[PDB]
Amino acid sequence: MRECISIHVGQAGVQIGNACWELYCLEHGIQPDGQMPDDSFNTFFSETGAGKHVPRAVFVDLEPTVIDEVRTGTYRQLFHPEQLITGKEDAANNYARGHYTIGKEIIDLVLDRIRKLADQCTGLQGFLVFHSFGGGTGSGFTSLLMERLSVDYGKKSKLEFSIYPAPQVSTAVVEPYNSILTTHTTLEHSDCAFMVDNEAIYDICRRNLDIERPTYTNLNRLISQIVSSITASLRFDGALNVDLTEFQTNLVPYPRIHFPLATYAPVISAEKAYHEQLSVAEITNACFEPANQMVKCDPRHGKYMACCLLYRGDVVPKDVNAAIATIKTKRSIQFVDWCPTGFKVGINYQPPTVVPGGDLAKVQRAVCMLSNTTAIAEAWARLDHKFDLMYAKRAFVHWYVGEGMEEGEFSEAREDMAALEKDYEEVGVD
Amino acid sequence: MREIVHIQAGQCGNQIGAKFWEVISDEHGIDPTGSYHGDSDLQLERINVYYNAKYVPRAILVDLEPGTMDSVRSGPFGQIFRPDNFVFGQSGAGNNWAKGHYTEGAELVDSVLDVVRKESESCDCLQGFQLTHSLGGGTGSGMGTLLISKIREEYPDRIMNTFSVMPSPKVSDTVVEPYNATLSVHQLVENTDETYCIDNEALYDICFRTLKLTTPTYGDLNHLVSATMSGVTTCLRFPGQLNADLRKLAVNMVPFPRLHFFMPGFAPLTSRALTVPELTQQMFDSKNMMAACDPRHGRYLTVAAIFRGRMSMKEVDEQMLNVQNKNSSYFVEWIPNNVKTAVCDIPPRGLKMSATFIGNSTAIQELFKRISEQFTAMFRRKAFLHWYTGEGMDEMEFTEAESNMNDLVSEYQQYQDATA
């Protein structure tokens, strides 16, 4: 059809992939072995001819432990075995190991396996890349992969789903360095990237699901709910965001500023007692509540470059228009100067799906708002400050220089980040 | 990374190394025969890290003294060790670092490296080396450092971990020990990635003051060492709830290559279970440190804390946070989130709840100052210097090592006073 290949890099990226592909299977009625009782989800699944549906997906990690569980677990028959790729020793939370020393040992193998998936696409749109910012592999090998894919697939789009580190969810002291390094090397190679702040997901599981200490499974199933909201248009033949290129068109007027904020509603515990299903207006208003954002930042503070609303379920178009109209009269929505102020609307009419027996209640209508807002600069600034504190002492730098990286790449990355903060500042200065 | 290759050299090295295998064998359910008698698959999930499948410790026993191999071989767990793994001489080192590094040790070292090599080549993926030795004597100190440098030459990309016992006259009033330990510390700053500073001075003080032992023995001190080594290796040995090898640990613990000397601690100390506040308070208490340094005299660059036993994680996170919050002065503010907590649900033998502490603190300069002052006292009267130069050792190596250790001290001092 118009195929997208999903690539999952490092522990975070693999485990979020697991949740995402779990949910996709549920959404399309595909079983853990690829069976089910020209279909639109053929963008994300190949179809053999015996009725086996195979995810267009690659899993890569520089050590085998996480991917070994995929090869042994519930979905061991879902993916091609040659789709699941492991090395022997990981990047030790070290971008430079992931990008240079260890990553170069396996980059060509990864590209060969990607090439074989691509050769089974009639009209490949591009790639969705899932990875952590803090991991040595998630950061370092992702950057290497993104550079190589820009050369080998020059005209294909590449989108990122990346995990923003947070002290509340197993970060490490070097992660800020890794976040900046990957962001700098990837920036020119990614058309659009959706950041997930681990503290926001953590906050939401704690508040909305009453999970005091969210597990990765808790966090990743919520994450995959937002990811599914974002990729639904590619799997259900939408009217909005019908292909990867359209994400840039609809969300990214300025190529460097390509980090839209995802706000999702409603997140409701399956343990909550009976209650009336929330209306289109109610879930639309909730899109403007900071507590529902995927990245912690103050939107009241910023200005909008672009905004899409992706609805799922029992959603009547006139009710969306009335809800949006209400928002514009009641909320102070400011667009930056030279960007059209229309909200783009997508409606997927299929009921939103949850993992049976998970934490998330099944709802009659859900919405994911994607807003490219300058408020997300506050998240870059938080990262940059942590980087600055360590780097002013050159703390931990020697670990990177010893693994094939020149010390100048640290300041080169930081400078790029500083221009990115100024990009945000200048695009939204009154 | 999976497997770890363990080396124990010298008297001290082999006695603490033997105690280490007893504790962790008991923890993993490996009996004195090498037969598994444990009650949980958790005990076996990472047996591979320290054992080769019956389970045989991946340990190489080394001494230039013959009898210490006799004493371990008939020790409680002396039969688990591979016989071929015993590499010993007959001469001995005579508390002389230069005999261990340059003569008697140099003659035995290639034999050890052949055993190391065949243990390495059997490893799926080698995670690194760990060495138990004392720095105050001749074999563990001099030949241990020679081994360290040889391994670093043959395995440049592997982690070198060491548990090094620091001399104290409280325990061994032998006046050449500051010489041997300064020569060794010089080796350590250049060639190890991680060194746990096991300070005999602190061991004695803990036993004497805290444990109320009138005359602490090597068994009493080794009781604290073995419990410390079990605790710092807990995340290597038991299923996490943490996907990290020795390298990932070094990366996050060591902000500057030379500052890789850790102050280990343990709670509760022993020879009723504690609450989580108790555990946390004691774990940061000077009395619980295995290095004779007051942490309130310095600042923490990095801290790792490992809790063992069934306990409330929200209580732990809160305890750790308020300690950092209440005592922010003691924590370097230009390493965000430099206090990391991990938890393991399997407690050590004879305990429901424990906490192990790994601190990279600038207060450890007090340990090196102590040694340096004793080295300078001896060196300036030039006593016994000929024992060393007579083995071919250049005298300049003495002043070189002293300079390196004093550079270490000031390097801690500037990060102690660095602001952000």
């Binding site: 670990w399 | 700053v189 290559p257 250049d394 300049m396 190596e397």
Partner: peptide
């Protein structure tokens, strides 16, 4: 006997 120099291990990084 040749001996180890200060900073000689710093070269690895």
């Amino acid at each position: 006997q040749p001996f180890l120099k200060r900073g000689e291990g710093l070269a690895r990084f």
